[PDB]
Every structure is written in structure tokens, then in C-alpha cells.
Amino acid sequence: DYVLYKDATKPVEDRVADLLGRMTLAEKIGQMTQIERLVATPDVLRDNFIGSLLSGGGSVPRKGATAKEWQDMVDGFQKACMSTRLGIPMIYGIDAVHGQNNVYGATIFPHNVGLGATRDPYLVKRIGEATALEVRATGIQYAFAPCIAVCRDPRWGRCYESYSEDRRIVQSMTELIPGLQGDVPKDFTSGMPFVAGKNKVAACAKHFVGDGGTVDGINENNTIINREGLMNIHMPAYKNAMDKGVSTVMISYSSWNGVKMHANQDLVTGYLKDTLKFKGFVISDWEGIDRITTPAGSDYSYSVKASILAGLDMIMVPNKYQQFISILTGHVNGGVIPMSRIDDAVTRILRVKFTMGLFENPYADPAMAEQLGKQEHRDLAREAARKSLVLLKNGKTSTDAPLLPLPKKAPKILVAGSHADNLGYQCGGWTIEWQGDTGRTTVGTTILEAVKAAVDPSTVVVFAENPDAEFVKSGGFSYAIVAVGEHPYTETKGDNLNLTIPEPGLSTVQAVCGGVRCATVLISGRPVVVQPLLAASDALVAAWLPGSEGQGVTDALFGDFGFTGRLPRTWFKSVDQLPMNVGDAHYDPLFRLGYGLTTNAT
């Protein structure tokens, strides 16, 4: 007879109830299971009824894979899932957090701390739109973004995934979500999941909650703050996410006052689901339930009980699915987890799959392949990079001639420093590899290439990565651009207690700037100890991690556009002040939240 869940004209809630009432226990637990593509096979997916797959950082079908290799990979997994008895399509997730950043040739946008400096929610909406197209070009339907952490200490290794220490800036940057997912209807109820169709992706607000609040910015550690602090600093951007229809929420590894978020029923069920009325699904982080215990994974059976009873809907296992499925079936068969907690989880996963069009369009669209790296996207990324630059200094004294903007026509100019010609340093973490990498890892324009592309044909451009002082003073340069800063890092590898840049950084600047007037371009994921760089430089520009389109840097240096960017964070004087945030008692910054100098276009 007639199968209502297969009928595309029926309300979402009727299709969900009709399918759910057919599923066995194996089929329901399979929907809650997300696994990494490395352990997936057609039989695994079909015999375990798997609901979701992901790529972790750097988990790609081949190095250099075109958009169509990605599509064929995702479709081949999808053909296995559509061949199960109920034919429930999988959803494939990926970290597309500054563009579709795992994929060769994708447009790489500025990381989020630089987007905070723009103060333009409309630009960030546009980046979400272009991001969704490049994720759908590879066949993927779900992005793990945005991170709406409110980083409160720049020593954290994920502070550059945070838009700001100020939760008001983070709130206004939740406009990424309707870029990624599409604008919600006039009809719309806060906390419903929404995706507009096959040119959009499901999004993910992460990581709930207080991930940027941890002690000493230690990654994954303990956020010590009282309920009012939680609610007035770390929480509010979640409620803006509910109003824009964010489809999924990801739970943090971090604790709140000693309680693991992955075992917190009060916050996850009591607040997120029952007070904000979130109706999408809640997904764990990568081996988040394992880390509930110390050592991690020492009582997996407890990890499964505590996290499913806290309210988590989908578990990113993501390798050992056999142990997860066995233990979870055991607890349900023993009465330890009731059936109604399972049916709630599966209801939520199915709600998002039906709402986004997945049952009607389970397969990739080959015509979307040419969205990847599209030029109009690279122009948008160029505009973002340019608006994220903060001019901190433009002249060594208040009576000096302003160095920027620089003339395009000069007899001879020097480009120096370890970041002047290194695409991987300019993009930072979460770019091609999980940790990012060095060198020419993808398509884009370095600073040196941007300089060659901008100057008059008669200007001679010399490059030296680390020139000595005598080379600079005898070379006859009119000016130098020197680019230095942090190396790429992600997560705990970026936790950093000293906040000073690797050498050579300071000594290249000192050599270059001692011989010729210099503009210093600092690439970093956060504020770093800056005083010595400031003292040597005529001009100093915080460029953050501007991504693949380095002509956004030279657009402002050479005066096609003015500088407009403003600090999205406090710049400290020393690491012994930290944490120090707008509002604190000991507030004594080198540069306040909100500072930046401007220029006008020539």
C-alpha cells in the first residue's frame, strides 16, 4: 500500500512519525551513529543502517581530488544507504569553517577572528552563501559551522575560530547561519531546523556551551563561572542561532564548574531542548563521550549511558561504531535507557533530513562542481580579507609622514619575511590538513604575488626571506613590506602560554626596518606580544589569517581602499595580565577592543 514517509507532498512531521513507527531498534540506533569515511564500506553502511558520515580534518579521497571525485565518493556511500530496507539517505558532514577548507582549489576565507574585525554581518552572510555552494559542489550537505564560542583568553588554541571576546559581536555574526542554510520564512518558529534546499547546507552551532571560557584558555578544560556569567557571556549567541533556524548543535568537550557538557542533562535537555525549544538534533564532538571519563574511553558503557541520558541525539563515534551500537542496544534491551529517549533522538535526526530535502535529493548535482573556487567567491574573500585588516600604527612619531598607503610606482622595493610567500602560513589551521601546513598547499595568491600584481611595471620588486641589515641598507630600496607571524595550529596544538611569534620574525623586522622604512604585516590567530615589533616598524598592520586571497592585503597597503577594520579583541601589554576583557577591573590594554586607525583610498 501507500507509504506516507515517501510522499514528498506531506508535512514533515507526518513523514517523520510515519517512518519512525516502522523502524526496528537496529534501524533507530543506526540513525544515531555517525562514522568517519575511513571506516566506512558499502556493507558497513547497509548492515548497520548508518545515519551519517563525516570527514575529519584532512580526511580526503585523494590529495588534489577534484570536486567530481568528492561527489562520486559521497554518492557511492549514498547508494549503500538508499539500498537498505527503508532507504533513509545518510547526511555527510565536514568542517567547512572558512570556506570548504579541506578541498584542494576551494576558496579559503579569513578565519573568524578577522571577520569579527570587519563588523559586517552582511558580508559574513554572503560568505555563508558562497561556502554552501562550494560545499554542495563536493556533494556534502552539512557543515560543522559556525563556531560561536566567545574566546575569553587568547592563549586558547581555538581563539581564532571565535569572532570576538565580546558576545555582542558574536551574536551579530550568527548571520553566517542563514547564509549557509537560507533565510527562514515569515512563518517561522525559533528553534525549528531550517534548510531551504539543495543549494544550501545544514549548519551547526558549536560548541555548546562555554568552550571559549576555559581556565587559562586550556583547550577542552574547565569553564569556571557562575550561572549568570554563563548566561550573559557564553549563551546568548545560541538564542540568536535558534531564531535563525540552526539545524544542529554540537556539544563541547569542555566542562562547566567541573561537569562535562557531554554528560550535562540540565544544560542539554533542560535548557537547550526544553527552554530554547530547539527541535533539530544535538551531535557529540569527536570522541566526546569517551572523554567523559579519565582516562578517556575507560568506561565506554558509562559514556554511552550518561551522554544518551543527557540528551545527545547523534554520536560522532567515530571509528568504533561496533562497540557503540552493541553497548547502546544492551542498555535499551536492559531498560537502562528507555525507548522514548531513542525515539526523540531519531525523531530529531529525521526531522532535519526531511526538512532539508534529503529524501527527495539524496545524490550530488554534477552541475554544482564548477562552484568550487569560483572567481566571484575569491573576489568576496578578497573583500573580506581587506576589511579584516587592522592598521595599528602608521608613522613612528606623531609628526612622521604617514607611510601607508604606499605608492605603486617606486624605483625598487623589498618584500621580506617568512610569511611573505607562504600560502599555508597565510591560511592557518583547518586548511587542507587538520593542522594547516606550510607552502603552496592549494590555489591562491601570497603576499609577494599580490605585490607583483599590484605595482607599476617599472617598480623593481626584490624578495628576500630573511635579508641581513647590510643587504637592506645597500640595496637602494624606497620601502619594504615585511610579513611575519604565527605558524598554523589547530585545537590543543595552538594552546600557548607565551604568545610570542617564532623566529625568525622579530629579527627580520629589526634587520629590514633598521635599514629602510617598513610596513610590517603581522599574520596571527590572536594578539601576540607586539611591543618590539611596534617599536621597530614605521607601520604595522594586523592581518589575522586572511586565507587564500592575498590581494586583499595589498588592496589596502597600496591605497585602492582605505583601512576600516577594528580590533575584535583586546590587545594586552603582557601575558601576565590575562585574562583581561572589556569590562574587567584590571583593564589596562595596549590597544582597546574597537581600536583601529583608518586611511582613505587614493
Ligand X SMILES: *[C@@H]1O[C@H](CO)[C@@H](O[C@@H]2O[C@H](CO)[C@@H](O[C@@H]3O[C@H](CO[C@H]4O[C@H](CO)[C@@H](O)[C@H](O)[C@@H]4O[C@@H]4O[C@H](CO)[C@@H](O)[C@H](O)[C@H]4NC(C)=O)[C@@H](O)[C@H](O)[C@@H]3O)[C@H](O)[C@H]2NC(C)=O)[C@H](O[C@@H]2O[C@@H](C)[C@@H](O)[C@@H](O)[C@@H]2O)[C@H]1NC(C)=O
Ligand Y SMILES: OC[C@H]1O[C@H](O)[C@H](O)[C@@H](O)[C@@H]1O
Based on the shown chain and the rule CB under 6 A, indicate whether residue 224 belongs to the binding site for ligand NAG: no
Least distance (Å) between residue 579 CB and ligand X: 17
Sheet with 248-251, edge to edge strand ranges? 204-208, 248-251, 281-283
- Judged by the rule CB under 6 A, the positions of this chain that interact with ligand X are 438, 487, 489, 493-494, 496, 498, 500, 502-503
Q: How far is Cα of residue 21 from the mean position of the Cα atoms in its chain?
A: 37
Q: Cα dist. 333→48, 72, 83, 263 in Å?
A: 17, 38, 27, 21
Q: What is the side-by-side strand order in the sheet with 259-260?
A: 222-223, 255-256, 259-260
For 268, which DSSP code?
I
What is the C-alpha R_g of the chain?
Answer: 25
Q: Indicate which of ligand NAG, ligand X, ligand Y, none lies near residue 500 (CB less than 5 to 8 Å, by partner kind).
A: ligand X
Nearby residues of 446 by Cβ (< 8 Å), 6 or more positions away: 420, 421, 422, 423, 426, 550
The sign of the dihedral angle between the CA atoms of 254, 256, 259, 261 is negative
Site string for ligand Y, 128-147 (x = CB under 6 A): ----------------x---
Binding partner selected for residue 206 from ligand NAG, ligand X, ligand Y, none, CB under the kind-specific 5 to 8 Å limit = ligand Y
- Which of 102, 181, 255, 388 is in the footprint of ligand NAG by CB under 6 A? 255
Pick what 255 binds: ligand Y, ligand NAG, ligand X, none; C-beta below 5 to 8 Å, kind-dependent. ligand NAG
Query: Whose Cβ is closer to ligand NAG: residue 295's or residue 335's?
Result: 295
Candidates 13-21, 215-223, 244-252, 412-420: pick the segment binding ligand NAG (CB under 6 A).
215-223
Between 220 and 437, whose beta carbon lies closer to ligand NAG? 220
Question: Choosing among ligand X, ligand NAG, ligand Y, none, which partner's interface includes residue 144 (Cβ < 5 to 8 Å by kind)?
Answer: ligand Y
Q: Which one, 27 or 285, has the nearer CB to ligand Y?
A: 285
Q: Which is nearer to ligand Y, 69 or 287 (by Cβ)?
A: 287
Residue from the set 6, 10, 13, 56 that interacts with ligand Y by CB under 6 A: 56
d(CA 534, CA 129): 38
- Which of residues 49, 163, 278, 286 is near ligand Y by CB under 6 A? 286
Judged by DSSP in three states, 258 sits in coil
DSSP designation for 407:
P
Residues acting as catalytic residues: 285, 491
Q: Which is nearer to ligand X, 303 or 524 (CB)?
A: 524
Planar angle of CA 217, 223, 224, nearest 5 degrees: 115
Report the nearest approach of ligand Y to the CB of residue 151 (Å). 14
How many Cβ atoms sit within 10 Å of the Cβ of residue 186? Answer: 5
* Contacted entry of ligand Y, ligand NAG, ligand X, none for residue 221, CB cut-off 5 to 8 Å set by kind: ligand NAG
Task: Select the residue interacting with ligand NAG from 101, 112, 164, 222 (CB under 6 A).
Answer: 222
Torsion 63-66-67-68 (CA) sign = negative
Contact 251, 285 (CB under 8 A): yes
Question: Is there a contact between 511 and 450 (Cβ–Cβ < 8 Å)?
Answer: no
d(CA 506, CA 500): 10
8 A C-beta contact, residue 329 and residue 26: yes
Strands 222-223 and 248-251, bridge-based pairing = unpaired
Q: Does 218 bind ligand NAG (CB under 6 A)?
A: yes
Q: Which of 27, 129, 153, 285 binds ligand Y (CB under 6 A)?
A: 285
What is the nearest approach in angstroms of ligand X to the Cβ of residue 212?
19
Find the helix packing angle between 339-355 and 300-310, rounded to 10°. 70
The nearer residue to ligand Y, 378 or 526, going by C-beta atoms, is: 526
Please choose which of ligand NAG, ligand X, ligand Y, none residue 118 contacts, taking the beta carbon within 5 to 8 angstroms, the exact cut-off set by kind: none
Q: Which is nearer to ligand X, 303 or 496 (CB)?
A: 496
Q: Does 508 bind ligand NAG (CB under 6 A)?
A: no
**Interface contacts to ligand Y, rule CB under 6 A:** 56-57, 95, 144, 206, 285-286
Where does this chain bind ligand NAG (CB under 6 A)?
218, 220-222, 255
